[PDB]
Amino acid sequence: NLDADLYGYRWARDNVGQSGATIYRLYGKPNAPELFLKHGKGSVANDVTDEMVRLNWLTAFMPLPTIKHFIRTPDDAWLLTTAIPGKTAFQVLEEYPDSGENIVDALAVFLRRLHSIPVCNCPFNSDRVFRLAQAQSRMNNGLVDASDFDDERNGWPVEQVWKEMHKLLPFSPDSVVTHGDFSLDNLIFDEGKLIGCIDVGRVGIADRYQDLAILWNCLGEFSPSLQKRLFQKYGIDNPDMNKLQFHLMLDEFF
């Protein structure tokens, strides 16, 4: 029973997280760990279901939350997981601004690990043909947040982002297992160490720049040096600006 797993907890609601799911924090239970409960209704039920199976798969290879219980009915999905203790990379960077180089070094190592998983292990497709079709549909359904674009595209109609993006194509993918939202909010640090990642709903085979682009974008809030250091430590000396720009533009749609 979900009820059995939830008994005796205090409940909070967190406005946070990748999809439009409702996120609950369960805490304050004596002799019991903190948990998270994601609830997806309607279309969002699919997003939560997507995360569940990706968590179930990727846990063999990388440190992620542990699934405690999952339920799917036609219109609803409930995903109960353990909490990874600690703070986000973003939080720790703000708290220890002097540790930026160490934080990025750890992020590169972690990303290198993820990208070293042989793609023959991965039953999920997250390639650009798949994501572009997802983006087209989100745009057409009116779901794109046009207020949240990067500075380069501030005030751009979503249609212009779409058109301009297609001028970069095509390129041959350098396919690896990707996280899909490798941002500073989704990597968790605890006592100095990067100990896990969260929000794995977009995990699948894709170009390595899917992850590199999003993290590089985040680091741009802090330091051009930290952005360059990410590529350097990851093992890339000449960043592919076309692939970088493509993936930044694609993320505008999500």
Ligand SMILES: NC[C@H]1O[C@H](O[C@H]2[C@H](O)[C@@H](O[C@H]3O[C@H](CO)[C@@H](O)[C@H](N)[C@H]3O)[C@H](N)C[C@@H]2N)[C@H](O)[C@@H](O)[C@@H]1O
């Ligand atoms: N709609 C839901 C999505 O919203 C955010 O994604 C958006 C980014 O945040 C935006 O970028 C802004 O925030 C960055 C730090 O995250 C800054 O570096 C950057 N300069 C900022 O423009 C980017 N333009 C679009 C991207 N879809 C969440 O991260 C993602 O999990 C969630 O699913």
Ligand SMILES: CC(C)(C)n1nc(-c2cccc3ccccc23)c2c(N)ncnc21
């Ligand atoms: C459920 C979801 C994917 C959104 N998630 N979220 C976190 C998380 C981590 C660190 C600080 C937070 C602060 C406020 C809300 C959530 C968190 C988190 C976590 N640690 N462990 C597992 N899932 C987490």
Ligand code: NA
């Ligand atoms: Na809209």
